[PDB]
Write an enzyme that holds these catalytic residues in place. Sequence first.
Site, mmCIF file in Angstrom:
data_model
loop_
_atom_site.group_PDB
_atom_site.id
_atom_site.type_symbol
_atom_site.label_atom_id
_atom_site.label_comp_id
_atom_site.label_asym_id
_atom_site.label_seq_id
_atom_site.Cartn_x
_atom_site.Cartn_y
_atom_site.Cartn_z
ATOM 1 C CE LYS A 184 -3.955 -0.114 2.307
ATOM 2 N NZ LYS A 184 -5.000 0.096 3.376
HETATM 3 C C1 LIG Z 1 -6.138 0.763 3.139
HETATM 4 C C2 LIG Z 1 -6.407 1.224 1.721
HETATM 5 O O1 LIG Z 1 -7.404 0.300 1.260
HETATM 6 C C3 LIG Z 1 -7.288 0.893 4.123
HETATM 7 O O2 LIG Z 1 -6.897 0.265 5.334
HETATM 8 C C4 LIG Z 1 -7.635 2.354 4.456
HETATM 9 O O3 LIG Z 1 -6.535 2.935 5.163
HETATM 10 C C5 LIG Z 1 -8.875 2.504 5.355
HETATM 11 O O4 LIG Z 1 -10.040 1.904 4.741
HETATM 12 C C6 LIG Z 1 -9.203 3.972 5.732
HETATM 13 O O5 LIG Z 1 -10.385 3.980 6.579
HETATM 14 P P1 LIG Z 1 -10.601 5.169 7.695
HETATM 15 O O6 LIG Z 1 -10.911 6.411 6.892
HETATM 16 O O7 LIG Z 1 -11.820 4.757 8.447
HETATM 17 O O8 LIG Z 1 -9.285 5.231 8.405
#
Ligand SMILES: *[C@@H](CO)[C@@H](O)[C@H](O)[C@H](O)COP(=O)(O)O
Lengths: 223, 223, 217, 217, 216, 223, 223, 217
Positions: G86
């Site tokens: 990521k």
């Molecule tokens: C990684 C990218 O898909 C995920 O873990 C994102 O960081 C989260 O979905 C972000 O969610 P929040 O806005 O609730 O931190």
Amino acid sequence: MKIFLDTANIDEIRTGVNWGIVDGVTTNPTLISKEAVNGKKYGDIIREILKIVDGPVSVEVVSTKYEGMVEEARKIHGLGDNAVVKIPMTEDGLRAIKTLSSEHINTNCTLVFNPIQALLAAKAGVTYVSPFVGRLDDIGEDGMQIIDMIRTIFNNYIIKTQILVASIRNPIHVLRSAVIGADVVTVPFNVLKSLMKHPKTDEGLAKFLEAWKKVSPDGKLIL
Amino acid sequence: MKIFLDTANIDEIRTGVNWGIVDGVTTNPTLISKEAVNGKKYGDIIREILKIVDGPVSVEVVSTKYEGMVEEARKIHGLGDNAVVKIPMTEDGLRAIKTLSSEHINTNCTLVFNPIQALLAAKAGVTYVSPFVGRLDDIGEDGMQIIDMIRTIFNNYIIKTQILVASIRNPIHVLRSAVIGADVVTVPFNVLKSLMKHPKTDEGLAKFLEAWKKVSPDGKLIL
Amino acid sequence: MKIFLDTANIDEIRTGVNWGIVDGVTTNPTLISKEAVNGKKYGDIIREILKIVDGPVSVEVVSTKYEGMVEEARKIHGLGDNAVVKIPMTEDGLRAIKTLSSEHINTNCTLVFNPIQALLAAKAGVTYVSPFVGRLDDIGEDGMQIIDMIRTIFNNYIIKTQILVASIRNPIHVLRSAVIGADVVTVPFNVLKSLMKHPKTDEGLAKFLEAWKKVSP
Amino acid sequence: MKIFLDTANIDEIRTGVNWGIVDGVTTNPTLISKEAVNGKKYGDIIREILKIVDGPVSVEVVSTKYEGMVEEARKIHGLGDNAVVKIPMTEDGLRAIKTLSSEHINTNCTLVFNPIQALLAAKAGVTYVSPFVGRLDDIGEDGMQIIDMIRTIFNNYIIKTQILVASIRNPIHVLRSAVIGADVVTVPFNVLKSLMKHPKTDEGLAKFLEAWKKVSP
Amino acid sequence: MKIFLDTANIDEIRTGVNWGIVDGVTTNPTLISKEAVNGKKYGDIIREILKIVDGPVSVEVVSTKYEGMVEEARKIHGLGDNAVVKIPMTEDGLRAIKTLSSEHINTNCTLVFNPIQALLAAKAGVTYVSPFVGRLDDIGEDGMQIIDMIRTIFNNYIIKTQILVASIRNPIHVLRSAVIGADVVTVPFNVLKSLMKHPKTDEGLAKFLEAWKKVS
Amino acid sequence: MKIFLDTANIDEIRTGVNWGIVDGVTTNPTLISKEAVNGKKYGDIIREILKIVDGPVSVEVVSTKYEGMVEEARKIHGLGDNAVVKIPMTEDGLRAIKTLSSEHINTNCTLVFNPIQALLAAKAGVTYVSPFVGRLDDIGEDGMQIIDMIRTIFNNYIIKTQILVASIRNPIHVLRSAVIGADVVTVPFNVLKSLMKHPKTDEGLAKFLEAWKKVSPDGKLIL
Amino acid sequence: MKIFLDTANIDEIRTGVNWGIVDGVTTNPTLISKEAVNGKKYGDIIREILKIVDGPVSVEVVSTKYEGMVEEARKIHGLGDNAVVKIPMTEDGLRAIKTLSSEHINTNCTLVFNPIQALLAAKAGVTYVSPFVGRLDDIGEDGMQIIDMIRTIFNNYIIKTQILVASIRNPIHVLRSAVIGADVVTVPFNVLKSLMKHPKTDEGLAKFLEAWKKVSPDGKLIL
Amino acid sequence: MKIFLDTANIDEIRTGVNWGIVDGVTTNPTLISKEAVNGKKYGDIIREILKIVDGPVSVEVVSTKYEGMVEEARKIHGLGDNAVVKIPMTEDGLRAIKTLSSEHINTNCTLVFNPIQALLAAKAGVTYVSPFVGRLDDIGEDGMQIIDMIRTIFNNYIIKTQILVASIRNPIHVLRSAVIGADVVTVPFNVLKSLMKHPKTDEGLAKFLEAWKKVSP
Ligand SMILES: *[C@@H](CO)[C@@H](O)[C@H](O)[C@H](O)COP(=O)(O)O
Ligand SMILES: *[C@@H](CO)[C@@H](O)[C@H](O)[C@H](O)COP(=O)(O)O
Ligand SMILES: *[C@@H](CO)[C@@H](O)[C@H](O)[C@H](O)COP(=O)(O)O
Ligand SMILES: *[C@@H](CO)[C@@H](O)[C@H](O)[C@H](O)COP(=O)(O)O
Ligand SMILES: *[C@@H](CO)[C@@H](O)[C@H](O)[C@H](O)COP(=O)(O)O
Ligand SMILES: *[C@@H](CO)[C@@H](O)[C@H](O)[C@H](O)COP(=O)(O)O
Ligand SMILES: *[C@H](CO)[C@@H](O)[C@H](O)[C@H](O)COP(=O)(O)O
Ligand SMILES: *[C@H](CO)[C@@H](O)[C@H](O)[C@H](O)COP(=O)(O)O
């Protein structure tokens, strides 16, 4: 939107009125014949409904000829000021509506299945017009589309005849009628009862009860 | 929506007026000529229709020139105050409408086939404009779309000329005219009578008559 | 879109065929009984149409029961390969269509007034389904909306039954059928005659003739 | 979208072919008789256009009867392989189109004013159909709506007849034809020239020239 | 969607080429007369752009006449296989495009302000067509509506000419071009850098940083 | 669109199949309990329906736990190759669908009330998913809107699970399902019977009969 | 539509995988830091999630500079072939995605808040792009409209980058993502479990259990 | 649109009131029971909120029967003029609302999940109706569509009952409520806090502060 009960069952009518959500009643010869069993007379049933319902009560003529229709309509009107005379969409029925309108007798034109029939009934002066959505559904046409066209037509000409949606079979007939803006729906008792209910209402009441027991074991609000 | 009868047939007119759903009558030279046979003369036909019909009765001039049209129109006006003078959409017809408008003689501009023709007739002061939907259908364009554009144009400018849909061929011209909000339709007799009818109306009458006989052997409502 | 003529009048059929714009014919018991008068026999009328028309010719059974419909349908089929057997939308009719379809006898389901009846006829294997638009107009419902829904339903399921628009009363039924994409329209003769015509066609021919007379008198 | 020139004026045709944006030419008896003056003959005008235009060249019959139409068409066809026989929307004209298509002679059905006339021409096998948008505008109906309906109808039935928009009067007829998806437009010469032009093009050319002289006298 | 840089500035082009998201370059005589100041010659500027940029680089003729445009276009072509010759929407431009197409010289028709001009350029065989959205905005017409119509027209006729949205002034020209489906946009450097940025991206980086510092 | 009958009444099933318009049957524990009265066993009813119906026949597990569900599903599958195992939308039900899918046992996920439940059942590999439109109508939401969203979602991902519209109450549920493009509807017998009928079909048959008597008094087609 | 679990909680992941509706997992530094407490170290957490989850497992780099990101990404890639790296939407992140793309290391571009950011990530070759709908909702713009525009852009250009909707807060983000046609959603555990539930499902189970007990006292289906 | 705070937490209510953006408060038995802990009494919590908040304060009856609801509603009303009695959508609730409305006691009908329940509450004379959007979202239905329908229904019949959107979970429930035209939203504290905020507001304040420091250090 007014909500009428579409039945002649006195018990249903008593119960609906006590919820305070019933604004009137519609009957027809079939609904009345269902209750005129085992000694009970149709005349007593009609008079009783007129007695216990403060709102309009629609009662249908049984004659098919102009003279029989206006004669019976004057008799029906005589039974109480809340009586509304139900008259079918026919040549003789339109003639009868025009006469009775001139006599200040409220009328309901029934057995309407398309928007131009409804317009013809309005032009004769009818107080209410009753398009039959469920029987259109039965023959594979979405009956609510006729209600939508009638509402548009009536809006176009500032027609004062009330649209009374009839032959209602389910709560979505009722929902769509309200969104369109029909003046009245008339509903069977089973449909009426379902309109108040929702599974999330039930669940929410149970959750509120349980949370309140944490703070008041007897479950009361002491203030 | 007003409903006029599009015929010179005295019996049809008498029948439809007896029904109470006819607000006036339109004629033209062809419709009159079909009835001015076997001794009957066109002047008797017109005078007799004027007598029967309380509402507007549209009667067409036969001159094509301005002076003849205005002379004819004043004679027609003299037959009765419910006479409306039908004048074609031509240069001399517009001149005649403007003159007659100032004389407070009611007028009906006919042979209109697009919205701007209708607007020009309104600007000359015409009481009614008659676009011909069926003759547009005959040439492969949906005539009701011209009614829709005329309704919009007239709404835009608060025009008081009434839209009188003519050359009507079926009940869906009538339905669409009402949903659009046309002021008047004029319909042949065969079309008028069909407007009240629906097979589910007939089916429903028959069931209610059967239910009634279950509670009243004679068939008479006694209240 | 195929264009059929909706009549049993032999003179109309001859005239329309000679114009080159008629792809087939539909009949029904009322249309035939109108011609079968003053000595004329209904058997002869049917046979004459089958000979004149190259394309499909629809002829309706009169029996109301399954066995009688299939027997009549086989006799109709035997009159010529272009014969199509018209069968009403009833319980016995759907059974008959199913049997005739398995016998490779072409069929046309008639007296259809909503889209689910049309779907049922298609599920029985019918070659053509005929929704009646004009009779719906008669009762205050725009019949062309049923054609639009059937076309959508048939497209959804890749249905091979052809939509044959019937009870046509005017050229705008025809125009709307083509824009929707119906497979076939069947039209009465006075509608057929008007389809080629337009007043601006007539006016333009007169102008071109006057123009040509200035260069070649 | 193909672009044809709608004229019989040889200087216009040559100029527009010199631009390389003209794919063919349409004529009619009125246009030809405008240039058939001062001793110039209509036959030479036609032959000269055929020689200069690589693309299709539409030339109208003047007969009104089937047999005269067909004899003329073959003579027009014999003037060059790029000739297209223009035939009016009439009972005789449809018959002529059907015959000529079987003879592999290309055709253009003209004087079309609604979509069902266009459909009848396509069912007769015509190579091009020419609806007249400007003459519809003249009588108060938006002619481009008819083009839009014909495009839908032809798409529905996978029709191979090309839509050739005719009676074009301004560049918005051209723009709307392209957005609809018409196969061909035929345009007068004054419309053709305007299609390349825009005031911001001219203004931009002036600013780029002015800025260019800054770094190169 | 391909993304080009709309500048003659060597420093901007080199920076954006370092970011890995620039696919090509467009220039024009005004852009190049801005860099050819204080001892810079236009000829060197073009060659250096050609060398840095792998992708297509459009270079505009300055001649107005067919003969001059074709001769200039061949000189431009000879400079590098990735050169694309920018030719204005005029009579002689359409004739030059047709000739250059026959010679397999890539072309980009410029100063296009409506959809039918774009169609004419495609009919002449042009490789790219460049409608100017910002200059339409300038005169009170939403220029993105012309892009939408050109997309529809090109789809209708399966036209292989690429739509190259030019005169781009802001990131919403870019967003709308991508939603319409234009093949290419060409953007000034201010615009290009802004496309990667969003204040919630900045805020999220700092919060992840803070959270990671509780663990390492 | 396939049309299934939603009943366990053997007489209804026999009648519908003979019309040739019934492509399968769905059952559930309530429908079966209705017919398992007065000596008749549920096991005999199930076996009989599987015998007389050539199309799919959906039969619901009654266990609520994964192991009971897959055990009963293998028993149901054993009764005939046209058996389809109906499994409710639960955590254990999804686990059971995944197992049985891997065993090539056809499955029907039932008691679905929103589109994401339906997607979850597709991701587990279910052969059919059954959204309940009538019970949504009951709680004042138009159930057909869920069918429309499921169709879109399934189209988006080329999902091969069939949409089987269930809890159907009227012919307009059926019409709207076909227009949306649902794979299957399952309908009570009363609804099935109404789908073939129309009052204009009746009237037209009577008019054709009368016209034919003019040319053939015995009312036959002799060829 | 693929469904990923958005957590670093081992129990939630184990539970959701046991359900068979979880296709992978996404983490980030905050989600890992919440679990790296009371002795547990971040490296154990990641390795353990990689072991449990067969599908993609997204693991975020902590460097902000290109060289550190690519070095971290190669270490992450070495933990297991289902690891996805990521990387945030920054200039150095796009450079890193392009480098890693060429090395056939799968990538997930995060902290995306508009459609053009998503397009740039796709042009760098990213395997997944993660727009954050809930954080857009927090600032007063409907985050799902960005998903809709991204779906259209990616369809226009046949882009193979998968849309991975992130920052999901409720089941309607999930419904709308499926109706739009997003490739993946990643959801918190509380959201996942709710996706299977509906009160009418529960009500329907209870009625079927009651109907079953009327025909089988024990409660066991015997076939 | 009025904005209410949906909490019984006195600290949240004090803070939100001091910001000036809170027009009223809604509570329910779960919200109160969360605060009425560690000695705190539910009667004191209710009385404290009524004193702090100038605007309407909704307090729910706990009885399920008509007589008990009306008795509890009268005690709630007597606590302060700004008290509003929250009554669930049930048969007894509709009767209670009708009686309390005739006694000029303001009422709020709660646990409403579709538009016809809302209409029934309006017909009983209720001052506010509270459809729950977040609990509909929970069960996979977009709750804001119910708000849109109720607004249409109420506009059709000139209904004076105020739409009070409840079960709000995020700022887009609030945005959509305003665009639809709901009369009131009631929001939890963490939603309330976010409504004033935007990252570009924060960034612009920092830029303006740097700009100002160049002219007045
Ligand atoms: C990684 C990218 O898909 C995920 O873990 C994102 O960081 C989260 O979905 C972000 O969610 P929040 O806005 O609730 O931190
Ligand atoms: C007078 C103008 O309203 C009318 O009588 C018209 O002439 C007719 O309605 C025209 O109808 P046809 O097109 O059927 O002649
Ligand atoms: C057969 C079905 O294709 C046709 O002959 C139809 O019976 C007629 O088209 C129905 O027309 P009418 O409604 O005018 O009888
Ligand atoms: C032949 C058919 O393509 C053309 O020459 C047409 O006749 C003209 O385009 C008609 O144009 P006008 O309406 O302006 O005569
Ligand atoms: C060439 C064609 O793509 C480009 O360099 C254009 O000239 C510019 O994009 C036009 O920009 P301005 O309107 O801002 O000059
Ligand atoms: C009263 C009705 O206006 C409010 O306190 C509601 O009970 C809550 O807004 C419901 O919210 P939850 O769904 O979050 O319990
Ligand atoms: C009177 C007309 O308003 C009503 O009693 C109608 O007769 C019924 O509503 C008709 O309903 P059914 O179609 O179910 O008989
Ligand atoms: C099986 C699922 O396809 C069917 O038997 C369903 O249980 C019924 O269709 C549900 O209908 P009811 O809601 O009327 O019980």
